[PDB]
Design a protein around this ligand. Structure first.
Ligand SMILES: CCCC[C@@H](CC)COC(=O)c1ccccc1C(=O)OC[C@@H](CC)CCCC
Ligand SMILES: CCCC[C@@H](CC)COC(=O)c1ccccc1C(=O)OC[C@@H](CC)CCCC
Length: 296
């Protein structure tokens, strides 16, 4: 099932602080290539158990969905911010007609595992508490892309113990298994934007020691019991190392009686939902909207 022609062409044609700017610079380029919709935003800070975490609450023109979204951005645990993922959250907000809190969680290696996992829970728990004050259901919807998809997944699995109501989880090409090699991983290890060397490195920045790989707050795919987790939208790209662990984990949720929609965007690569030059980005944001209609 061959590459999308638009993605094909993108691939064809190409210090910590330095690489971060570079990645910020790459994002904002795209945001000028394809302007985001305007949206009302508030800046703010949540008092978490690991310090203050900056957040941005998005507010849609029409409010249609009954629960807040909590978005954890990607970037491999080392890159990204609220501004990097403005393009996606903006659209999620307006297309879905929901309130989104984009979380500025602490980055690695200056914060190590499992600090951001903690932050993300505290913020979710904060949003649950705030939700009635906005005229919404206390339940929330966690969402993320890649590393952020990982957090979403982990927050969901801790949700019951942490007494945090979650009505759904949205996983955009997440990382779920740092222990197992998989056909897609292996097969798409170099040349499809997300590479294996990058992934080894990210895991050195993020983890304390190499044994953290088999920890379920790092590898949520390894948790043997998935019964009664929140409904899941699991979106994967075809030519992506993380594709296979994403799809297996979705099959597993489904076998554990968790309402699951899994969707592969054929011909696409990892990161495509923060890459608005592709039509498939907004096609997936449409999938998020449709899925979330079914949650009530
Ligand atoms: C704008 C969104 C895309 C950005 C993308 C980089 C281009 C990052 O997306 C990822 O999913 C990711 C990519 C590379 C490395 C890691 C990840 C990831 O989250 O965990 C994978 C494990 C594997 C050992 C590493 C950390 C181990 C504690
Ligand atoms: C269902 C969970 C997938 C996760 C994975 C890791 C545990 C297990 O994969 C397999 O068991 C597998 C083994 C041999 C051949 C294919 C597959 C497979 O996934 O087929 C995916 C096909 C189209 C449907 C790709 C076509 C486009 C490139």
């Amino acid at each position: 099932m061959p590459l999308d022609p638009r993605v094909e062409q993108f691939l064809a044609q190409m210090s910590l602080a330095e690489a971060r700017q570079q990645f910020k610079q790459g994002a904002l380029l795209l945001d000028q290539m394809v302007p985001p919709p305007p949206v009302d935003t508030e800046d703010g800070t949540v008092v978490t158990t690991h310090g203050p975490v900056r957040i941005r609450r998005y507010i849609p023109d029409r409010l249609r969905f009954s629960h807040p979204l909590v978005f954890y951005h990607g970037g491999g645990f080392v890159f990204g911010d609220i501004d990097t993922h403005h393009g996606l959250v903006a659209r999620l907000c307006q297309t879905v007609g929901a309130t989104v809190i984009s979380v500025d969680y602490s980055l690695a290696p200056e914060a190590k595992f499992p600090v951001p996992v903690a932050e993300c829970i505290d913020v979710a728990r904060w949003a649950a508490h705030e939700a009635p004050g906005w005229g919404l259901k206390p339940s929330i919807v966690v969402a993320g892309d890649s590393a952020g998809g990982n957090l979403a997944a982990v927050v969901s699995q801790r949700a019951k113990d942490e007494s945090l109501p979650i009505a759904a989880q949205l996983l955009f090409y997440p990382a779920l298994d740092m222990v197992h090699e998989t056909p897609s991983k292996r097969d798409f290890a170099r040349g499809y934007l997300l590479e294996a060397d990058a992934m080894q490195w990210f895991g050195e920045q993020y983890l304390r020691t190499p044994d953290d790989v088999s920890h379920p707050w790092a590898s949520p795919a390894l948790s043997p019991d998935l019964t009664g987790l929140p409904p899941a939208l699991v979106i994967t790209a075809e030519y992506d190392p993380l594709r296979d662990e994403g799809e297996a984990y979705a099959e597993a949720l489904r076998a554990a009686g968790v309402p699951t929609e899994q969707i592969r965007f054929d011909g696409m690569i990892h990161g495509f939902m923060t890459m608005p030059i592709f039509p498939q980005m907004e096609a997936a944001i449409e999938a998020v909207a449709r899925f979330l209609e079914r949650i009530d």
